[PDB]
């Protein structure tokens, strides 16, 4: 019923700028932004980059929106993203969630 959406956006701006338009259409209630490294593989070679990652708490049912949304204005034509899912929470913290996206 309920997920971590986890995203990495090349940039600070464009993840604060994904994350308030997922806010602002309700798609999700939190989102937490932090620096990483990546190294993937990509036309016969490792390529490393600096990166955002991104945690996004909201419903399941949720997921569709959440990642066409994402994708429409992502800077990468294959952008990561990933559901988590949440196997348990704190109930009012969880119905919090519920009322926002709802």
């Known amino acids: 019923m309920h997920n971590f959406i986890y995203i990495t956006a090349p940039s600070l701006e464009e993840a604060e700028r994904?994350?308030?338009?997922?806010?602002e259409k309700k798609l999700a209630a939190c989102v937490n932004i932090f620096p990483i490294?990546?190294?993937?593989?990509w036309e016969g070679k490792i390529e490393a980059?600096?990166?955002f990652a991104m945690i996004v708490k909201t419903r399941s049912e949720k997921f569709a929106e959440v990642?066409?949304?994402?994708?429409?204005?992502?800077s990468y034509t294959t952008p990561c993203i990933c559901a988590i899912p949440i196997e348990r929470?704190?109930?009012?913290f969880l119905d919090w969630i519920?009322?926002?996206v709802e």
């Open 18 to 23: 994904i994350a308030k338009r997922l806010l």
């Open 37 to 41: 490294k990546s190294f993937f593989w």
């Open 49 to 51: 980059a600096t990166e």
């Open 67 to 74: 990642r066409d949304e994402v994708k429409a204005m992502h």
């Open 89 to 92: 929470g704190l109930k009012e």
């Open 98 to 100: 519920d009322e926002t």
